[PDB]
Design a protein around this ligand. Structure first.
Ligand code: NI
Ligand code: NI
Lengths: 243, 243
């Protein structure tokens, strides 16, 4: 009823295989996908070392092309190689997100199925330090929970409050974006025809491409804690300290 | 073919009437509206001192209600009091913008007329200091120049460049929002039925309400220099120094 594809990268050098409490990161990610109730979970990678490690814990791996460098290109190649029909729901779960609640993965799939193109997940920001951290991605929502914008900048900005952080309390006000999407397979062909935009390149946020091209992304707010993922060595030590 | 309404506020105390090179600010604004080729230019205010000064330089003034406190409430009351038909194009020119090129005012009206709800104007940011100044409003555009978001935050954020401002060059990358809109009168009734949203209150940007409610705002990029307007005493001294 839905399938998970996990794009996993090697060049944090050796990222997908960094040890987290005994298991490589990609294994943690894979386990979250299984527990979600996905019909099938597949790891998509262009790296043979990642293939080896994932096959050795029993994962199905789709080897993708060194040409297809973005996560979504990988997903697309894998989705073609695996034979997914245009009506099938794919969850793209980034290999840098090892701590997404499995129920949230499923909820994301349900959201996209409930409504007749792309859904993604976010979580409340309650700590001022996280809001203002340029490493975190913020997302601003409209009334119906569609994304208006995604940024590293602290948005929405408190015109009269951000200059007084000691009195600043965050109360339903701000959301952090999680690296997971739900897409129908059909959408990936249209998506891949679109070129990049300046904002996506500045922010290094590929999802801005969808907004640039007049597309919409529906957001689901995770009920449960969704710890931030792992892109830096600081992130890795934080996540290792959860166990 | 289009009409300008200028909402003008008194409580910068005494804002609309601050002296700029011999004439109150509101007079400068009014003159830009006349030069635009507007069929009619009307000042909307709930303040009798503003009425007096504007009538004494020959302006038509619509006295609005002390209850109707937002600029758009003023515009709406004035638009009703003046008898504007639902198909008529209103340009809302804020009383804090004395240096908008008259050709840009007209271009904004044309934009809205060319396309079958709300248009607004922006101008390129070429100075890093302006981008990063929380007083300035930034706007992010989609491919067809619709606004995705408006903020005081520096957006789009340069993930890998904002930590190296000495090498940062702004090249078609960033836009500053100007306090001017074009609306058909018809839209104002729908607009006024909408309630505020958290983001509009944090940012103090009323235009976020339109985005919140799933509305769109088409942006025109001014060809000519559009100096920032006047909301603070710093702004006033800068603008006085242009003359
Ligand atoms: Ni507070
Ligand atoms: Ni540079």
């Amino acid at each position: 009823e839905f399938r998970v594809i996990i794009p996993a990268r090697f060049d944090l050098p050796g990222k997908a295989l960094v040890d987290i409490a005994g298991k490589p990161m990609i294994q943690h990610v894979y386990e979250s996908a299984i527990k979600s109730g996905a019909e099938e979970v597949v790891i998509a990678t262009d790296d043979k070392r990642i293939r080896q490690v994932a096959e050795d814990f029993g994962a199905v791996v789709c080897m993708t092309s060194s040409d297809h460098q973005s996560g979504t290109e990988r997903i697309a190649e894998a989705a073609v190689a695996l034979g997914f029909e245009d009506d099938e729901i794919i969850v793209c779960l980034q290999g840098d997100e090892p701590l997404i609640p499995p129920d949230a993965i499923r909820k994301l799939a349900e959201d996209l199925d409930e409504h007749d193109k792309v859904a993604s997940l976010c979580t409340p920001i309650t700590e001022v330090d996280e809001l203002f951290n340029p490493h975190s991605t913020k997302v601003v929502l409209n009334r119906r929970n569609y994304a208006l914008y995604f940024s590293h900048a602290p948005i929405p900005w408190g015109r009269d409050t951000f200059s007084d952080k000691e009195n600043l309390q965050l109360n339903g006000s701000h959301y952090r974006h999680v690296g997971i999407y739900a897409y129908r397979v059909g959408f990936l062909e249209e998506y891949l025809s679109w070129d990049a935009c300046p904002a996506e390149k500045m922010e290094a946020l590929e999802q801005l491409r969808i907004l640039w091209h007049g597309g919409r992304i529906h957001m689901v707010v995770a009920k449960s804690k969704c710890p931030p993922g792992v892109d830096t060595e600081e992130d890795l030590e934080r996540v290792r300290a959860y166990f």
